[PDB]
Write an enzyme that holds these catalytic residues in place. Structure first.
Site, PDB file in Angstrom:
ATOM      1  N   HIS A 161       0.826  -1.202   0.000  1.00 43.62           N
ATOM      2  CA  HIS A 161       0.000   0.000   0.000  1.00 43.62           C
ATOM      3  C   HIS A 161       0.862   1.254   0.000  1.00 43.62           C
ATOM      4  O   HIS A 161       0.608   2.189  -0.786  1.00 43.62           O
ATOM      5  CB  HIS A 161      -0.974  -0.043   1.209  1.00 43.62           C
ATOM      6  CG  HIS A 161      -1.743  -1.333   1.321  1.00 43.62           C
ATOM      7  ND1 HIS A 161      -2.715  -1.718   0.414  1.00 43.62           N
ATOM      8  CD2 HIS A 161      -1.691  -2.323   2.246  1.00 43.62           C
ATOM      9  CE1 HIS A 161      -3.235  -2.877   0.785  1.00 43.62           C
ATOM     10  NE2 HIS A 161      -2.615  -3.277   1.881  1.00 43.62           N
ATOM     11  N   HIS A 199       5.003   6.766   7.369  1.00 44.76           N
ATOM     12  CA  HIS A 199       4.778   6.427   5.973  1.00 44.76           C
ATOM     13  C   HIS A 199       4.217   7.675   5.295  1.00 44.76           C
ATOM     14  O   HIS A 199       3.938   8.684   5.946  1.00 44.76           O
ATOM     15  CB  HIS A 199       3.803   5.251   5.855  1.00 44.76           C
ATOM     16  CG  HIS A 199       2.465   5.591   6.424  1.00 44.76           C
ATOM     17  ND1 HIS A 199       2.160   5.409   7.746  1.00 44.76           N
ATOM     18  CD2 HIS A 199       1.384   6.228   5.868  1.00 44.76           C
ATOM     19  CE1 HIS A 199       0.932   5.887   7.977  1.00 44.76           C
ATOM     20  NE2 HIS A 199       0.426   6.391   6.850  1.00 44.76           N
ATOM     21  N   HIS A 249       1.572   9.126   1.841  1.00 44.33           N
ATOM     22  CA  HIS A 249       0.579   8.965   0.794  1.00 44.33           C
ATOM     23  C   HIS A 249       0.942   9.963  -0.300  1.00 44.33           C
ATOM     24  O   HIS A 249       1.338  11.086   0.013  1.00 44.33           O
ATOM     25  CB  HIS A 249      -0.830   9.266   1.325  1.00 44.33           C
ATOM     26  CG  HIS A 249      -1.183   8.440   2.530  1.00 44.33           C
ATOM     27  ND1 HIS A 249      -1.962   7.322   2.455  1.00 44.33           N
ATOM     28  CD2 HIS A 249      -0.875   8.575   3.853  1.00 44.33           C
ATOM     29  CE1 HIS A 249      -2.091   6.793   3.672  1.00 44.33           C
ATOM     30  NE2 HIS A 249      -1.436   7.527   4.546  1.00 44.33           N
ATOM     31  N   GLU A 290      -3.964  13.386   1.777  1.00 43.54           N
ATOM     32  CA  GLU A 290      -5.229  12.864   2.305  1.00 43.54           C
ATOM     33  C   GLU A 290      -6.054  14.021   2.881  1.00 43.54           C
ATOM     34  O   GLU A 290      -7.162  14.319   2.411  1.00 43.54           O
ATOM     35  CB  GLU A 290      -4.935  11.766   3.325  1.00 43.54           C
ATOM     36  CG  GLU A 290      -4.211  10.603   2.684  1.00 43.54           C
ATOM     37  CD  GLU A 290      -4.499   9.295   3.367  1.00 43.54           C
ATOM     38  OE1 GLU A 290      -4.201   9.203   4.572  1.00 43.54           O
ATOM     39  OE2 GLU A 290      -4.997   8.383   2.686  1.00 43.54           O
ATOM     40  N   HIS A 318       2.772  10.772   7.470  1.00 42.97           N
ATOM     41  CA  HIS A 318       2.106  10.402   8.711  1.00 42.97           C
ATOM     42  C   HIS A 318       3.097   9.730   9.658  1.00 42.97           C
ATOM     43  O   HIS A 318       3.627   8.656   9.349  1.00 42.97           O
ATOM     44  CB  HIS A 318       0.975   9.407   8.421  1.00 42.97           C
ATOM     45  CG  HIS A 318      -0.163  10.042   7.705  1.00 42.97           C
ATOM     46  ND1 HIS A 318      -1.138   9.335   7.019  1.00 42.97           N
ATOM     47  CD2 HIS A 318      -0.473  11.357   7.611  1.00 42.97           C
ATOM     48  CE1 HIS A 318      -1.987  10.222   6.511  1.00 42.97           C
ATOM     49  NE2 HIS A 318      -1.612  11.445   6.864  1.00 42.97           N
ATOM     50  N   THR A 372      -6.717   6.094   8.123  1.00 41.86           N
ATOM     51  CA  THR A 372      -7.170   6.403   6.771  1.00 41.86           C
ATOM     52  C   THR A 372      -7.096   5.203   5.836  1.00 41.86           C
ATOM     53  O   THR A 372      -7.434   5.329   4.654  1.00 41.86           O
ATOM     54  CB  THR A 372      -6.426   7.572   6.156  1.00 41.86           C
ATOM     55  OG1 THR A 372      -5.083   7.112   5.917  1.00 41.86           O
ATOM     56  CG2 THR A 372      -6.443   8.801   7.020  1.00 41.86           C
TER      57      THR A 372
HETATM   58  C1  LIG Z   1      -4.645  -1.730  13.335  1.00 37.18           C
HETATM   59  C2  LIG Z   1      -3.943  -2.309  12.179  1.00 37.18           C
HETATM   60  C3  LIG Z   1      -2.747  -1.478  11.829  1.00 37.18           C
HETATM   61  C4  LIG Z   1      -3.050  -0.037  11.441  1.00 37.18           C
HETATM   62  C5  LIG Z   1      -1.856   0.638  10.805  1.00 37.18           C
HETATM   63  C6  LIG Z   1      -2.112   2.059  10.364  1.00 37.18           C
HETATM   64  C7  LIG Z   1      -2.983   2.328   9.317  1.00 37.18           C
HETATM   65  C8  LIG Z   1      -3.210   3.628   8.885  1.00 37.18           C
HETATM   66  C9  LIG Z   1      -2.542   4.682   9.500  1.00 37.18           C
HETATM   67  S1  LIG Z   1      -2.808   6.352   8.956  1.00 37.18           S
HETATM   68  N1  LIG Z   1      -2.738   6.357   7.363  1.00 37.18           N
HETATM   69  O1  LIG Z   1      -4.148   6.697   9.397  1.00 37.18           O
HETATM   70  O2  LIG Z   1      -1.726   7.108   9.497  1.00 37.18           O
HETATM   71  C10 LIG Z   1      -1.680   4.431  10.557  1.00 37.18           C
HETATM   72  C11 LIG Z   1      -1.475   3.127  10.979  1.00 37.18           C
HETATM   73 ZN   LIG Z   2      -1.282   7.372   6.552  1.00 35.52          ZN
END
Ligand SMILES: CCCCCc1ccc(S(N)(=O)=O)cc1
Ligand SMILES: [Zn+2]
Ligand SMILES: OC[C@H]1O[C@@H](O)[C@H](O)[C@@H](O)[C@@H]1O
Ligand SMILES: OC[C@H]1O[C@@H](O)[C@H](O)[C@@H](O)[C@@H]1O
Ligand SMILES: OC[C@H]1O[C@H](O)[C@H](O)[C@@H](O)[C@@H]1O
Length: 257
Positions: free
Chosen positions: A61, A91, A93, A103, A116, A195
């Protein structure tokens, strides 16, 4: 499984993850005129001096830079937060072109990418428990715009060729995430969600107002990653962003007057 294509992207996620239509989903558009200064916010403390990065992973992803979160090292405190939140990973996006990729949006404007930095509330002991709590996570979001190169990003860019496909990882020790911040810590904050699936409503979002600048060459290298695994047909890892979701019964607060 879920992804970012026509047949498995954000408009489909709600079937497996019905919270996708929930009351505090992320990201959102940040209407800068309606956002209100909040005097109850405490000073924000980004304390990353002892961070221990470990590894970088292409998870199909995005790519995650992972940290040793077995003890309090790089943490986030203050602002809207009660207690201490430990950095676990960061990470990004990003888009297929510079005009989209973020986002969150700012008065509907889309940035080229969004960083993020993900943290979990230490009162809950582990990340999996934290994601069962309304205040389990804090994500520090930073916009990227294309202009001058970001020197502290280049080490990330240069390792991406070694993790081109889903499931590949590489050692990524001794990386300093302080090199990814802008100068100002002015921010907006609101309660939201992850997200990506599982879209859990556990996150205090802290979105910095000041973007960082990265060069075109840097973001072009993000766009050479692949969603697919080794040996499979190439699908460029681009447009791995969820669009803005309904604000519903929320207010966005500003740290600045
Ligand atoms: C609970 C399973 C693991 C979740 C990992 C995760 C996913 C999305 C984000 S984000 N893009 O909101 O920052 C952060 C962390
Ligand atoms: Zn993210
Ligand atoms: O190597 C990246 C960073 O790692 C941290 O643990 C150190 O305390 C920092 O001085 C260093 O910049
Ligand atoms: O009732 C007045 C209050 O309304 C709330 O919606 C706002 O967040 C507060 O800033 C305000 O003081
Ligand atoms: O700091 C992250 C990484 O940057 C560079 O790739 C270095 O060669 C490597 O040793 C380090 O792990």
């Amino acid at each position: 499984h879920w992804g970012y294509g026509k047949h498995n992207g954000p408009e489909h996620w709600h079937k497996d993850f019905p919270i996708a239509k929930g009351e505090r989903q992320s990201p959102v558009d940040i209407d800068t005129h309606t956002a209100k200064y909040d005097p109850s916010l405490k000073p924000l403390s980004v304390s990353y001096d002892q961070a221990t990065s470990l590894r970088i992973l292409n998870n199909g992803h995005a790519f995650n830079v992972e940290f040793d979160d077995s003890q309090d090292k790089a943490v986030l405190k203050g602002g809207p937060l009660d207690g201490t939140y430990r950095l676990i990973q960061f990470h990004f996006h990003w888009g297929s072109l510079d005009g989209q990729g973020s986002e969150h949006t700012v008065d509907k404007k889309k940035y080229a990418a969004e960083l993020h930095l993900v943290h979990w509330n230490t009162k809950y002991g582990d990340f999996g428990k934290a994601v069962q709590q309304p205040d389990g996570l804090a994500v520090l979001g930073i916009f990227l715009k294309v202009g001058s190169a970001k020197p502290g990003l280049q080490k990330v860019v240069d390792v991406l060729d070694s993790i081109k496909t889903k499931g590949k990882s590489a050692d990524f020790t001794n990386f300093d995430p302080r090199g990814l911040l802008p100068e100002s810590l002015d921010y907006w904050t609101y309660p939201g969600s992850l997200t990506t699936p599982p879209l859990l409503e556990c996150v205090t979002w802290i979105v910095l107002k000041e973007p960082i600048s990265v060069s075109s060459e840097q973001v072009l290298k993000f766009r050479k990653l692949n969603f697919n695994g080794e040996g499979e047909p190439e699908e460029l890892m681009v447009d791995n962003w969820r669009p803005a979701q309904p604000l519903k019964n929320r207010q966005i607060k500003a740290s600045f007057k």
